[PDB]
Symmetry: C3
Subunit: 165 residues, 3 copies
Amino acid sequence: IEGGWQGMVDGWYGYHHSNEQGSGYAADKESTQKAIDGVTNKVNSIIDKMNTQFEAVGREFNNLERRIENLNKKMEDGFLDVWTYNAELLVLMENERTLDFHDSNVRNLYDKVRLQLKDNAKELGNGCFEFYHKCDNECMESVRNGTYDYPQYSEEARLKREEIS
Amino acid sequence: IEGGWQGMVDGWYGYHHSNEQGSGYAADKESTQKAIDGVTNKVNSIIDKMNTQFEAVGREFNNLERRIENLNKKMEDGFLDVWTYNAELLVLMENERTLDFHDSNVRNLYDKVRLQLKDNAKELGNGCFEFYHKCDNECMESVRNGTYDYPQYSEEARLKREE
Amino acid sequence: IAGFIEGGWQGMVDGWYGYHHSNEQGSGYAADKESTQKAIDGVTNKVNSIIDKMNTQFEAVGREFNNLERRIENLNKKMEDGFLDVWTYNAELLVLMENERTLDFHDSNVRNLYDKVRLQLKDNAKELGNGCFEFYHKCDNECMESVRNGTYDYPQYSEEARLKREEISS
Ligand SMILES: *[C@H]1O[C@H](CO)[C@@H](O[C@@H]2O[C@H](CO)[C@@H](O)[C@H](O)[C@H]2NC(C)=O)[C@H](O)[C@H]1NC(C)=O
Ligand SMILES: *[C@H]1O[C@H](CO)[C@@H](O)[C@H](O)[C@H]1NC(C)=O
């Protein structure tokens, strides 16, 4: 799958079809909503799990108390280093996960289509299927539904498949 | 592949079949054991990698040493915040991974079956294969064994499709 | 000669992921250079971010409290021990976690390479079930290249493939 549909506005993952009647985009609302809910939950947990207490970070040691002030410096610097590393790596790690999540969702959508069409359509290798029969707007809907009737078009599909000969 | 078998008790991942003789569950013991070993290892590493040394957390500063007591408070609170966040996020993260691990294992089990019976089965979308030939209890066992004899049923298979 | 799902090619010195073919003209290994380079770049980036994101400042860790300042020395001990525990756990778990991810990454890349082939050679070749495809037609060195390219012309060999598909029976 090469890139994304700027023309598809209504969702995150979906379909594009073209036939004799015309062409258009249609979003898969189920998988889109699950993905939006998951990603929102990810961002929220990363925010909500932080538990911050009250504190008064202010330096109140005198010039004959510099060993204690240094002890405080080591501590403040220590926590800055811990949080910086953990925050940075958490972001890098969860970003990798989020992008793979989207990849995984598109693939599942592609396989749900593939397993219906079998040899009634040619996998073009770019996320698109070329049909071996005439697939109208009702036929296209059934492919999104998960109700595509394979035997109904299988004969017609078999003629055009060996018509290449 | 939607939903788990309450009827399948003997393992974690497995098979359900239905034929003329009846229907029933059977667990895949190889992939189940790998999954149990991995998950147990995950829990153990999360426990074992912690090293807690001895210490005496006790407050022993007087009423003219409150700046030092506050310094200790900032420290104790600091570590409580670090451990709380890391523990919480570690759990949430590894739980996501554990559930995807199971998903991944089921898919591998499904592919092992798919590659063993090419044109002999009709892939449905729910993790299920509809056979194009009559597959009895012996035939079903061989699919679990990993020694399903494809050529033996291959001819019969090409007939039910055009019926 | 096996496939991916029963070990690696010691004979493929070329790259990380790739192909092995055998036909009448001969046999050999061929690395997929695109996916190999992406994997090397990703893994190198992983190692570099894990190193580069660390931010270390100057400090003079030395114990300079006297024998009537042991409560303060203990406060320092709790702190030093605290950070040692935090870094140890995080470092250990980061390594274990990212190693799992790295190995699954490689697994995933090999599977993608296998599927790109499978979806081209539909019923023109037999999935042997060990990462290898047995062709039902004569596939020469140009034919093999096209399978790696992603340009394999299925209709061109489909008829020949259908003739041989019905032999074992009669
Ligand atoms: C999913 O789309 C399918 C497309 O086949 C719908 O079924 C068709 O509906 C049309 C008009 O609504 C009817 O003429 C037929 O009953 C169906 N067509 C065929 C060829 O059988 C189906 O209604 C859609 N899903 C839902 C839940 O409505
Ligand atoms: C596995 O089950 C089959 C039944 O199809 C049986 O014939 C065979 O003996 C079993 N395999 C082995 C190696 O014993």
